[PDB]
């Protein structure tokens, strides 16, 4: 149960507990008043650095809810292949549309 | 009126840029309504191969949407993307929308072939190619005004110590940094370290070697010092990108949970299950920023933005760099004068001045560095927050380029080249050649 | 290049390069490399009209 | 030259062996690319002989 | 014998390496990509300048002077602005022997 | 301006290569999107009469798509095929592409 | 011949028809689920044919 | 089942015992490490001839499982016919699409 009005409260394990969809409404629901009584031990700008992590960490965590909706990312480039000594390697920019019934 | 006779002379029929592909370009630079999703994407892609082929699909959607709405080709403000949109995405874009992206690349490569018509064969001199003593664009002594790599900076420094290659990066000498992912942020630092985040895949990385073709840097210069000032008439300005807030409002994700008994909803309006529906909108997320932006992007493709986890970017680093004049021009009387032209590692070029939307602030993501006198707005630099009210008049008259990024009389491109961009009615296709003639060296 | 008294440009690769690409074949330019003392001399013409 | 070795490496051999030969001095028939008719008649281009 | 011509350069693929399928040979000076020859693997760094002005044709495939088309017919291709239908005829008029 | 003014003087009205047929064929040589599948088939056909009537259905499905995506001609880099694309495929390729 | 013959051609059921559309038809050779990394079908789609 | 990190292992039968559906996965799933202890007796390029035979052999088994989906191949040209002395011979240019309901 993190509080965004207390800067020292924000951590990764607090932001990970509330998922992406909760993060969607977690940004608006806060209170306009900010509390400076307890600053951040690493500094207050560490909260914006912390903010990119939770979303990026939830990106690949979001596609897990979509795990049945997507495919495996292929090599998008040559030089990435299992064995090059029989066939050469293409790479696949995914313009296809991952979806599964 | 002289030069446009010189320039229009060089228009012997080398190459022309189709009139449709012109109006559909100006139609970009001049849109007051231009989707801010496009600016944010460039910040995400930030030039890299690996990032682009990952996000390759999102691009294909955004263009055709914007190409069918306003009928103006997008992503024009960066040549790196325009160089990819030709090579990678072959058949996705309509028959029509490609031709606009072929000509730019073509009509660039047409200008690069003037210089080798006008140079004689000859041995190298200062360690420089013989054409490099003729034309400015072939000079390594310059830099493109926007660089995503350390690669160019390698070559420029490598120029003869006679040509004195230093960099003040936030005020210090060049250092080049390997790659940048989630763990490494470091968006504020003034040190010399410079990312190389643009790499084909995860397997090949270095700071001391380029992965790309030989002419890559030249075509950039030809693009920014010729085409953009030909189309834009100098109404655009460079701006530093703040990577704090970019990925954030990018990694805000409303992607609805899909039920297996359903299909994949494609409709931004009627489908309650497509992330672009007005019910899924929560202020200032991506799918909600598509509402402010009017772009169609699919919920499942929204996922591929995950690859941001696999590559990130640092900041916008101001660079001075110095050079002494040529091996050919260096005389005991000349040797002590230098040329200072600044550049920006990891920066972006704005086009049109949207200051009047209280729904979009000026200083949220992109902050305005007027790099070079070619790049300054009247309505950009004036509409920034905290602009002194006294200079509002004079700001119309002169470029406000701050001396830390270099001044006029020391630069290698003076003022009078600029107004030749504004004051010449020759047209889009007859300026480009007229400019290329301007850039030969004395 | 008949004349003298101008500071040579600094790269002996280039300063020799230009001169050879100019003085060569010119109706005028010095034939023998400049005699240090009196004057340069014009190549003699085979016949005049 | 005589064709030698496989097709794939026939170019890399050449290049690697000729790196200096191409880099010693300019090549005649290409050096004349830019010659105008009237420049081609002057004493400047030595190829008249 | 059993070769293939490559119309337009694509070197930027990191999705397609250059030496995967087709190894480039510049048979005759009319066919040498200034692009193609420059982007081959291990292309000497110094020659990148010079390789733009001149074609690079391996002497195992025959040299300029000893071929049946010397240099300039190439440049009459690049330089002539006469337009496509007007060029080709000029070429068929170029090959009348002496 | 000589080599043309003669060749152009041979342009007396023998044959006009139609401007629309000029716009296409450039687009082929100028494609950086030109798909490598088209190269592979050539290596396959390798000039064979038989192999082409074997794959004759592929080429059509390959061309007409390409013609519809970029509106340009394809398989331009070998004349043998272009001679096959005529004497065989009459009504398959669109009214426009033939 | 290698990467023309590295093949995903899925078997067609006896009552099912022949797919003409590469996207939603699982039995099409070029179908994305049938596309496997750097293969013949993934080649046709890599080149969009 | 042949192991793809030893070149000497791959033969005609071991690949032919594998079908077209399993051909594509085994090539991407192999090990990135190669053994120099036991190479192929006839050399590396001698096996290059060996793998391309399997693909054609796999094309066959592919088009053998797909044989019931196609029609009887006709000659694509004249000159191949049983009776040329009553009527002459065509050959069928194949633009058609064999499929069986």
From TrEMBL, chain C:
Organism domain of life: Viruses
Protein name as it appears in the record: Major capsid protein
Species in which this protein is naturally found: Human herpesvirus 2 (HHV-2)
Shown stretch of the complete protein: 1130 to 1178 of 1374
